[PDB]
Design a protein around this ligand. Structure first.
Ligand SMILES: COC(=O)c1coc(-c2ccc(S(=O)(=O)N(CC(C)C)C[C@@H](O)[C@H](Cc3ccccc3)NC(=O)O[C@H]3CO[C@H]4OCC[C@H]43)cc2)n1
Ligand SMILES: [Cl-]
Ligand SMILES: [Cl-]
Ligand SMILES: [Cl-]
Ligand SMILES: [Cl-]
Ligand code: NA
Ligand code: NA
Lengths: 99, 99
């Protein structure tokens, strides 16, 4: 699809068996999802943006379905105010910015 | 251009006659630039990033060139980890996300 930017570029994702709404976010290096359980190993991480840093759990090799497209990669889980699909998974679905 | 996302989508901007680097950020509603001098009056604005809310200075109707494209619009000045070009100006340069 071509998504214009008049509005937030929100899509439906499926992660850990759950449907969520998330932002397609070219400004995020990694994907960050609100608190949820995911299976497997994780390690703590700090990530920072406007307003400072939050602590997250880093899960590797997690499969997401993003607007119907499957991608695998790292997901950071923590108290983000918005679910964010970052570049580490946008690349996998072939997303580009065009102008 | 068609910009892939394997690397950060950094571009050159020109504001106040100065060249700066900024991140094209589809997850930002607003354009936020590090401390600099801009003409005219400003108004207060609170924006909510990943780590919490901050105060910024809102300057309206500012001339800014983005990757060689002319835009005139609102620029927020405040403590951001990197200069970000948000949807308010991404729409002025005709940007879309595509996959
Ligand atoms: C380091 O290894 C990694 O890959 C890794 C490391 O760190 C990260 C990592 C991943 C994401 C973030 S971030 O969410 O903070 N962010 C980074 C940018 C600020 C550089 C992504 C933004 O798109 C963010 C996304 C956002 C959206 C809403 C609420 C909160 C955040 N938007 C945002 O702050 O926009 C503000 C300006 O316009 C307004 O509209 C929206 C809020 C406000 C930071 C670190 N990733
Ligand atoms: Cl990854
Ligand atoms: Cl590619
Ligand atoms: Cl450029
Ligand atoms: Cl604007
Ligand atoms: Na894992
Ligand atoms: Na000033």
């Amino acid at each position: 699809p071509q998504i214009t930017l008049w509005k937030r570029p929100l899509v439906t994702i499926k992660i850990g068996g759950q449907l969520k709404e998330a932002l397609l976010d070219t400004g995020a290096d990694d994907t960050v999802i609100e608190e949820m359980s995911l299976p497997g190993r994780w390690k703590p991480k700090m990530i920072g943006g406007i307003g400072g840093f939050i602590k997250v759990r880093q899960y590797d090799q997690i499969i997401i379905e993003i607007a119907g497209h499957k991608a695998i990669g790292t997901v950071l889980v923590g108290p983000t105010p918005v679910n964010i699909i970052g570049r580490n998974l946008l690349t996998q679905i072939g997303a580009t910015l065009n102008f």
